[PDB]
Write a protein that holds these residues in place. Structure first.
Motif, mmCIF file in Angstrom:
data_model
loop_
_atom_site.group_PDB
_atom_site.id
_atom_site.type_symbol
_atom_site.label_atom_id
_atom_site.label_comp_id
_atom_site.label_asym_id
_atom_site.label_seq_id
_atom_site.Cartn_x
_atom_site.Cartn_y
_atom_site.Cartn_z
ATOM 1 N N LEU A 49 0.953 -1.223 0.126
ATOM 2 C CA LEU A 49 -0.321 0.115 0.128
ATOM 3 C C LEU A 49 0.498 1.058 -0.101
ATOM 4 O O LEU A 49 1.368 1.559 1.008
ATOM 5 N N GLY A 50 0.479 2.661 -0.948
ATOM 6 C CA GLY A 50 0.931 3.408 -1.061
ATOM 7 C C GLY A 50 2.450 3.737 -1.725
ATOM 8 O O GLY A 50 2.902 2.902 -1.885
ATOM 9 N N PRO A 51 3.018 5.328 -1.456
ATOM 10 C CA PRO A 51 4.541 4.966 -2.454
ATOM 11 C C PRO A 51 5.807 4.534 -1.473
ATOM 12 O O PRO A 51 6.115 4.307 -2.738
ATOM 13 N N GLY B 11 -12.311 0.405 -9.892
ATOM 14 C CA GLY B 11 -11.511 0.013 -10.635
ATOM 15 C C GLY B 11 -9.850 0.065 -9.497
ATOM 16 O O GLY B 11 -9.028 0.872 -10.434
ATOM 17 N N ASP B 12 -10.167 0.425 -8.072
ATOM 18 C CA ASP B 12 -8.698 0.912 -7.487
ATOM 19 C C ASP B 12 -9.446 0.854 -6.187
ATOM 20 O O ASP B 12 -10.352 0.912 -6.077
ATOM 21 N N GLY B 13 -8.506 1.250 -5.527
ATOM 22 C CA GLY B 13 -8.685 0.626 -3.848
ATOM 23 C C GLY B 13 -8.522 -0.572 -3.443
ATOM 24 O O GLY B 13 -9.763 -0.603 -2.011
ATOM 25 N N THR B 14 -8.517 -1.046 -4.091
ATOM 26 C CA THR B 14 -8.639 -2.872 -3.542
ATOM 27 C C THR B 14 -8.051 -2.681 -2.033
ATOM 28 O O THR B 14 -7.969 -4.002 -1.575
ATOM 29 N N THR B 15 -6.297 -2.288 -2.105
ATOM 30 C CA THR B 15 -5.623 -3.353 -1.065
ATOM 31 C C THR B 15 -6.230 -2.047 0.376
ATOM 32 O O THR B 15 -6.394 -2.442 1.219
ATOM 33 N N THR B 16 -6.711 -0.926 -0.123
ATOM 34 C CA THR B 16 -7.212 0.328 1.220
ATOM 35 C C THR B 16 -8.742 -0.961 1.437
ATOM 36 O O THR B 16 -8.870 -1.056 2.290
ATOM 37 N N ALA B 17 -9.389 -0.690 0.625
ATOM 38 C CA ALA B 17 -10.658 -1.598 0.792
ATOM 39 C C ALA B 17 -10.236 -3.770 1.749
ATOM 40 O O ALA B 17 -10.826 -3.260 2.461
ATOM 41 N N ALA C 66 -8.857 14.302 -0.141
ATOM 42 C CA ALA C 66 -7.456 14.243 0.159
ATOM 43 C C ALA C 66 -7.116 13.080 0.742
ATOM 44 O O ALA C 66 -7.429 11.895 1.279
ATOM 45 N N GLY C 67 -5.655 12.599 -0.770
ATOM 46 C CA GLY C 67 -5.277 11.288 -0.298
ATOM 47 C C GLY C 67 -4.875 10.451 0.662
ATOM 48 O O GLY C 67 -4.935 10.884 2.160
ATOM 49 N N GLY C 68 -3.961 9.596 0.684
ATOM 50 C CA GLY C 68 -3.314 9.758 2.084
ATOM 51 C C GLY C 68 -3.689 8.648 2.804
ATOM 52 O O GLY C 68 -3.411 8.412 5.005
ATOM 53 N N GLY C 69 -4.550 8.444 2.861
ATOM 54 C CA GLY C 69 -6.202 8.088 3.836
ATOM 55 C C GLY C 69 -6.315 9.275 5.300
ATOM 56 O O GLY C 69 -7.004 8.756 6.197
ATOM 57 N N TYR D 87 -0.252 14.259 6.553
ATOM 58 C CA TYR D 87 1.560 13.448 5.610
ATOM 59 C C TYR D 87 1.739 13.103 4.111
ATOM 60 O O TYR D 87 1.007 12.288 4.129
ATOM 61 N N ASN D 88 2.602 13.595 3.328
ATOM 62 C CA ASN D 88 3.312 12.566 2.671
ATOM 63 C C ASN D 88 3.999 11.755 2.612
ATOM 64 O O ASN D 88 5.026 11.795 2.922
ATOM 65 N N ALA D 89 3.635 11.105 2.312
ATOM 66 C CA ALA D 89 4.812 9.193 2.466
ATOM 67 C C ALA D 89 5.602 9.479 1.390
ATOM 68 O O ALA D 89 6.850 8.986 1.361
ATOM 69 N N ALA D 90 5.755 10.020 0.092
ATOM 70 C CA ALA D 90 6.631 10.091 -0.457
ATOM 71 C C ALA D 90 7.488 11.245 0.242
ATOM 72 O O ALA D 90 9.115 11.051 -0.444
ATOM 73 N N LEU E 164 -4.111 13.117 -4.235
ATOM 74 C CA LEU E 164 -5.675 13.741 -4.374
ATOM 75 C C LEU E 164 -6.597 11.717 -4.698
ATOM 76 O O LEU E 164 -5.273 10.819 -4.776
ATOM 77 N N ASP E 165 -7.664 11.364 -4.164
ATOM 78 C CA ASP E 165 -8.047 10.123 -4.140
ATOM 79 C C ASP E 165 -9.971 10.490 -4.379
ATOM 80 O O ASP E 165 -10.424 11.389 -4.437
ATOM 81 N N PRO E 166 -10.577 9.565 -5.653
ATOM 82 C CA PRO E 166 -11.100 10.383 -6.328
ATOM 83 C C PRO E 166 -12.294 9.594 -4.892
ATOM 84 O O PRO E 166 -12.138 8.672 -4.839
#
Ligand SMILES: Nc1ncnc2c1ncn2[C@@H]1O[C@H](COP(=O)(O)OP(=O)(O)OP(=O)(O)O)[C@@H](O)[C@H]1O
Ligand SMILES: Nc1ncnc2c1ncn2[C@@H]1O[C@H](COP(=O)(O)OP(=O)(O)OP(=O)(O)O)[C@@H](O)[C@H]1O
Ligand SMILES: Nc1ncnc2c1ncn2[C@@H]1O[C@H](COP(=O)(O)OP(=O)(O)OP(=O)(O)O)[C@@H](O)[C@H]1O
Ligand SMILES: [K+]
Ligand SMILES: [K+]
Ligand SMILES: [K+]
Ligand SMILES: [Mg+2]
Ligand SMILES: [Mg+2]
Ligand SMILES: [Mg+2]
Lengths: 525, 525, 525
Positions: free
Chosen positions: A30-32, A85-91, A412-415, A477-480, A493-495
């Motif tokens: 998950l994530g960058p 079509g995205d966010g399967t790991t988050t789910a 906002a992304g990054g959870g 928090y910007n993980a990158a 960002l996340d849709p």
């Protein structure tokens, strides 16, 4: 065969162990700063991936009951995938979080049904709250940003997607193919493209793309619904000869006729695919004609007393190639003569002049643009077949994510979005204590995504979580870069659609597992 | 092969263990607070259900003797299901209760035959008493209530069923299909529908619905019985061509002819289905004509000296589709011309004017309504394929239960009806002490349903049971709200038919097991 | 393969154990208080039966030698069944009793051959004595009583059988079929029925009923014996066309011709069945004609210089259906015209007028009755398919027993007849002591049936046995009411034929086992 049957706690620990193996394998990606997972192959070198779905597909466990738990939660990713079509790991990490605490509460003696009710209530309110916070991804800049972010900060892929959507529109059809070698290529082909997919799978001759592809086929343009195969019999046979496939573009192909087409083309007996005509009402007929002018066909409408039986291969239109997705039909290189086509353009061009309404004006301009929608094709750069195949994958995913982003606002992304939502629900309560615990289980699980992203970075989840919760708004928090800041300003960002879907499918499967009292499986023999 | 043989007690403990595994797995799903049971699948995620029948189907045990006990009591649910289409779980807990105490009495040295006689006597009197307490489900409000209750308090499903029965009558045909997406749809199709099912299974081409479906078939309307195939030979061959199926609507198709049709259509040799003509006597002929006028066919009656041999495809009627259940035939979209049909309506409309009897008046109005019965089709709402498939299931069950409710009065639900009956039988006695114990076994088992419903709620069975027995009449426990009250006023009703069936099948199988002295099965090898 | 071989005592204990398992399983089902035996099935619920034969069929043992003993005594029931169609359980308990004491005597050192001789002598005298005590079952009241008793006290079944025999005579053909639903039906069909069965099995196309059934067949009425197939060739081919089966009603079909028919109809090559013509001598020809007049055929007798070769399908008679048992042929619905038939009746009606002898008068009336025998069909009541299938079984057995009762007088039931016979043989002696022990073994075994009936009631065998032996005549124990009384007056009768058969087959197999010195079987490998 003889079964093994488990109840309550015995079943619960098995399920939990099974979801943990699956979720733990998946969540490291998950994530960058996602980590690699190596998947063994029967031949050659192992697969190395940071793709959650790829990992999930390989997970199957020996213990029959643990395997059941893994296969159940695996449904979370697959549904979230099909829907957004995205966010399967988050789910998947949300599901593990909800299932883990939920089963603990059950073991503690709390009422499973109440726990599930509480979780459900929290998710219902959370989704409303998510909509409230949702902002848009409309301009090409935003599209570029989302694309870049979805391409692992590859601004190149970002520009490509933005340009492709600028050509065929953000609602248009876009595909990606291997490049000729070094440097990307973007070209619009027929041709035209409209929003209508196959009237049923099976027509799908290329499951690799889950789409249907026809070469130099005939195009029947019927302005009416087709229920009886009888009407088709005459034309289908005319097409049986000349050895060319047939594309049916009617108002609609209903059961009887459709069912036959599916069965016949299923037996190699003439290759035919059917799709609904673009638009509806009046504009439908006008548009069905634009296709005719483009493919050199003739519309067969009952309004002029025309019959499908009295239709020859001369009435049918034709194009070098046509591709149809789950919801898109693209006709590439039509036989129609530039004389007729360009003339048709001039007509519609005046239509816009005589336009007394913006709506009618917009709709007309849409037609001229399509005829003068088509399909934007993205050919990925190269410099060695390996890198080329890789970049192609990234462009595919980035495109998929950006498409989702364009459809429904962004958060906002990054959870951080789910964390903000959770904090706003601190006073939410239910009908009893057990329902309140369920609500808390859900709000706690909402921090899991941010915590796993941080954990994958090698940082401390609780510290970062604590700090993000400390601020507010788009503060995250910007993980990158491992820096705090405004998630939106940093382009993370996340849709809203994928976040919402991930949460709902996670809570849905979790609710089912939490309310499971018994499991039945074949005896290990 | 070599057998394992067990007698008396050895056999008894085995049977008891087998019925306990099955009943315990099934009974947790009883009532509004029923728990989930997870059923393993060879592929994908496990099934999660609160449906008793679904659980029973999966139960098979390793120990050969225990498996026999499970398969035997499993017959209870299946018979109750076939007879009333609901109450299988209730029937299963009644059976377990009767079997458990009955086998204990046997182990205690009591005479099995007397025990069974006592149980039988109690059930005989209990059923009479059940009829005495039985009230009706005639008006649409009652139908709506029962539907809602059977749909897990979903007032939506309740309204649907009520409206569907309002269209085609509570005795009419009603089906449910997947919806087009969001929002339910209710429409009556051909067409007409009459109360006559297939003259034998096998004709069933779609076991999924256990019904027969024909597309654009020919309809032979013979006003007489058909015993000899010879008569059909000429018409069957005429229908052999044109490649269309045939629907035989004669006064009746007897052995010889029927047997042939079953065998031929069994070999793909012409698709033909047969059903009796609606009504009997005089009205039969008049009705057989209404079908002709609707399908554009010609009645072939011997009264006018007509022969089936001298019948061409021109005499046969025709419709786009026809569906036939175990006891219902529905003709959808007939070829008949609105001129003839509407004219036929006018005729029967005057018939009603010249009607000198209410009976004749009612019968005539029934015909005009049908011609001007058909089939009400319920298309379930949606908003995601998953939820849509789910709601469809609920509507199906709710419909099934409501249909049963409409047929035979209603009694207080929540297991209170059987408790009231049991209390009224406190002084019932038999020919001896053992018979008296059997009677008591049965009266005690009658409390089991209410006790299991309460147990599934997480409440105390004895306390609630004690309180309900304390009051009288429709006083019961509402497990959904966990409040006592008037079961009827709260809308918690059960068709008297399902309660009666559950009790009789439970006592029937229980009686057999209690009087079983020996068991034979293959040696575990 | 390699064999296991056992001698004397080693073999004896094995046999005894094997007959005990079988007899013990079977004997619990004896009499009005017979217990249930549960038989496992590979699929579904186990079978629950009180039918001895059903239990015996399932008995097979693991130990090869014990299995041999079980299979040997199993021959007792099967032979008694084939010969009398009832009393198989009685025969089995008599056999066990004789075998048990007989083998004990052998182990004691007594001469097996003498033991067998003594047993045989006792049985020979017992049978004579049984005939002496035998009374009749001629009037409909007696028939009703026996039927009721054989139907488990179901006076309904009793009335049915009585009425059926009143229609077609107690020697007539009677069948039972599933009912239409609720309420029984009794109707005589063609038609006519005469006492002649198939001239050999194989013709049996429905082993379920062990009978032959033909639909719309041709009926060849040849008044002579048929030895050469040549004669048939011409007619058989004429019947080969028209695709209809053929029924041969000749004076007799001997080897050559018969053998061919069996082989041909065995290969689907034309369906033909043969049966002898009714009666013999003169009346035979007259009767063969009655069939012709009924079926519209033409008798082919050599007396008028007619040849079978010169016989066309026009000479052959015809009927909608014909059924033939082991000893009965029934022609249902013949083509003959009521003109010819009713005229034939008038003829024979005058024959009776001109009758100068009672014998000739009786024979003539028999013909008019048949033409104006047929087949009585009993359609069992219903009220649910389960109960209907059950009652059908009872009617079938009750009929079978009553038929036997009608053939040969009746004696007191409940095992008292054999007890009275045994007491009358107290002074019977043989050539030596060992023969005397054998006689005593047999007289002792004669009490076994009454003792087992009592034991199944839950009463004390020795006490009841002692009391019955105390009185005399028809004094016995009514196991249904548990009261002593006059067995005949209480309607508890057994056809002398089944009692005699049970005893003879039991003694026969017992004698063989007692004189067995060695056993050979495959090695358990
Ligand atoms: N720089 C960043 N800092 C923090 N979070 C980021 C950053 N870039 C992306 N993300 C977040 O990472 C998450 C997406 O990661 P990832 O693509 O690995 O998993 P997924 O989309 O949940 O599942 P899938 O395996 O289907 O991709 C989103 O929450 C996204 O906003
Ligand atoms: N609010 C309620 N309170 C108490 N009992 C209720 C309530 N609603 C329904 N019931 C009762 O629950 C029972 C039906 O439950 P359920 O549908 O789970 O099992 P079933 O019908 O016995 O078997 P099946 O598995 O075939 O449905 C009936 O006794 C019904 O009256
Ligand atoms: N009320 C009664 N009292 C005593 N004996 C009875 C009574 N009714 C019937 N019987 C006797 O029971 C015996 C028949 O029982 P049953 O039919 O169970 O066994 P079976 O005929 O020996 O074998 P099968 O299994 O072939 O029927 C006969 O001896 C008959 O007279
Ligand atoms: K990833
Ligand atoms: K349930
Ligand atoms: K019996
Ligand atoms: Mg992703
Ligand atoms: Mg139910
Ligand atoms: Mg019997």
């Amino acid at each position: 065969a003889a079964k093994d049957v488990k109840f309550g706690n015995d079943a619960g620990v098995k399920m939990l162990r099974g979801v943990n193996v699956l979720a733990d394998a998946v969540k490291v990606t998950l994530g960058p700063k996602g980590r690699n997972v190596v998947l063994d192959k029967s031949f050659g070198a192992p697969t190395i991936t940071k793709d959650g779905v790829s990992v999930a597909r390989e997970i199957e466990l020996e213990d029959k009951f643990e395997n059941m738990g893994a296969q159940m939660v695996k449904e979370v990713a697959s549904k979230a995938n099909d829907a957004a079509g995205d966010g399967t790991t988050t789910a998947t990490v949300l599901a593990q979080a909800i299932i883990t605490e939920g089963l603990k509460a059950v073991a503690a003696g709390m009422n499973p049904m109440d726990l599930k009710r509480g979780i459900d209530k929290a998710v219902t309110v959370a989704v409303e709250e998510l909509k409230a916070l949702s902002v848009p991804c409309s301009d090409s800049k935003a599209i570029a940003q989302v694309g870049t972010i979805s391409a692992n900060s590859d601004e190149t892929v970002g520009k490509l997607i933005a340009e492709a959507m600028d050509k065929v529109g953000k609602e248009g059809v876009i595909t990606v193919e291997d490049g000729t070698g070094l440097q990307d290529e973007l070209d619009v082909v027929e041709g035209m493209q409209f929003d209508r997919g196959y009237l049923s799978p099976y027509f799908i001759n290329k499951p690799e793309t889950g789409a249907v592809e026809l070469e130099s086929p005939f195009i029947l343009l019927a302005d009416k619904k087709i229920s009886n195969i009888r009407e088709m019999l005459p034309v289908l046979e005319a097409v049986a000869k000349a050895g060319k496939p047939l594309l049916i573009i009617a108002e609609d192909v209903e059961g009887e006729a459709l069912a036959t087409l599916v069965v016949n083309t299923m037996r190699g007996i003439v290759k035919v695919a059917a799709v609904k005509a673009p638009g509806f009402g009046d504009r439908r007929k006008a548009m069905l004609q634009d296709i005719a002018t483009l493919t050199g066909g003739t519309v067969i409408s009952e309004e002029i007393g025309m019959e499908l039986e009295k239709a020859t291969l001369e009435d049918l239109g034709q194009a070098k190639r046509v591709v149809i997705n789950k919801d898109t039909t693209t006709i590439i290189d039509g036989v129609g003569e530039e004389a007729a086509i360009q003339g048709r353009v001039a007509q519609i061009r005046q239509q816009i002049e005589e336009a007394t309404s913006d709506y009618d004006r917009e709709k007309l301009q849409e037609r001229v643009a399509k005829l003068a929608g088509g399909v934007a094709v993205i050919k990925v750069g190269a410099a060695t077949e390996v890198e080329m195949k890789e970049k192609k994958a990234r462009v595919e995913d980035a495109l998929h994510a950006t498409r989702a982003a364009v459809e429904e606002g962004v958060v906002a992304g990054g959870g951080v979005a789910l964390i903000r939502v959770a904090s706003k629900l601190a006073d939410l309560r239910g009908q009893n204590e057990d329902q309140n615990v369920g609500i808390k289980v859900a709000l706690r699980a909402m921090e899991a995504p941010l915590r796993q992203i941080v954990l994958n970075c090698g940082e401390e989840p609780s510290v970062v979580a604590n700090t993000v919760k400390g601020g507010d708004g788009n503060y995250g928090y910007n993980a990158a870069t491992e820096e705090y800041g405004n998630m939106i300003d940093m382009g993370i960002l996340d849709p809203t659609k994928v976040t919402r879907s991930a949460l709902q499918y996670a809570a849905s499967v979790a609710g089912l597992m939490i309310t499971t009292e018994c499991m039945v499986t074949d005896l290990p023999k």
